[PDB]
Design a protein around this ligand. Structure first.
Ligand SMILES: C[C@H](CS)C(=O)N[C@H](B(O)O)c1ccc(F)cc1
Length: 264
């Protein structure tokens, strides 16, 4: 990938202080916008969207997987697990765990689903099977958030994120019912209102998955966006920064999303 009118991104990046990674594709025309699209960024919680997709893929071979109740214990409840916390006394079904992971970034729910899939290596294997050779998940929540500069653990690239997202939501990687369920989960996300969603015209439908590592200014969002009467746009906006204490910026993510969309 390349971009011969990259200066707007370059200036936004310089003002932010860190690194911005953008890839956006118009699935109707094939046009793309890129900026550090081939460079590795920490996934943070954005792996949870692909995790739910991997669950749906398995459910195509395992009848009633999604309906399976999980009666998890208190010591599954790592921090930032609001749904799993709320429902501890009842347990939750695999489907509910998947929805909570996507729509609230629920940590405990992600760990429980990772265990069902064979851990970070199992999710990574799923991603290889749809043709993503960049994605790697190595660790569990919360250790995967360390976001250390240059660490390839728990990273992917904006372009591979977008390409996989397109395969899973719009392409053929998931069966049509599973594909619709994944799209619906993304559309019901509650964590992304200040990121890509803040850049999209109010009348376009959006599904998204956010990520927030909590360190090194590292945060991200990927989304499928449905313009008026048009084929959908798929995009990914990732950030990081060189100092552990650097704050992430939702406004930067929104602004880079807007530059991508305006570029398309
Ligand atoms: C250690 C950090 C706290 S800022 C964390 O748990 N991040 C996950 B994720 O991005 O991997 C997370 C972040 C925000 C949430 F609301 C839920 C889960």
């Amino acid at each position: 990938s390349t971009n011969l009118v990259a200066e707007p991104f370059a200036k936004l990046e310089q003002d932010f202080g860190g690194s911005i990674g953008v890839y956006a594709m118009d699935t109707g025309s094939g046009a793309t916008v890129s900026y550090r699209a081939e460079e590795r960024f920490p996934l943070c919680s954005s792996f949870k969207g692909f995790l739910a997709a991997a669950v749906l893929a398995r459910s195509q071979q395992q009848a009633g997987l999604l309906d399976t109740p999980i009666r998890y214990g208190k010591n599954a409840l790592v921090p930032w697990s609001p749904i799993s916390e709320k429902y501890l006394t009842t347990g939750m079904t695999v489907a509910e765990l998947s929805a909570a992971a996507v729509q609230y970034s629920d940590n405990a729910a992600a760990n429980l689903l990772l265990k069902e899939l064979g851990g970070p290596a199992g999710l990574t294997a799923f991603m290889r099977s749809i043709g993503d050779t960049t994605f790697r998940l190595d660790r569990w929540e919360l250790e995967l958030n360390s976001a250390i500069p240059g660490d390839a653990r728990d990273t992917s690239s904006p372009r591979a994120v977008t390409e996989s997202l397109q395969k899973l939501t719009l392409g053929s990687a998931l069966a049509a019912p599973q594909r619709q369920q994944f799209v619906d989960w993304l559309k019901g996300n509650t964590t992304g209102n200040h990121r890509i969603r803040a850049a999209v015209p109010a009348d376009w439908a959006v599904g998204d998955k956010t990520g927030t590592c909590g360190v090194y200014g590292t945060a991200n969002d990927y989304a499928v966006v449905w313009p008026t009467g048009r084929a959908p746009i798929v995009l990914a906006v990732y950030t990081r920064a060189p100092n552990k204490d650097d704050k992430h910026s939702e406004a930067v993510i929104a602004a880079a999303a807007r530059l991508a969309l305006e570029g398309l």
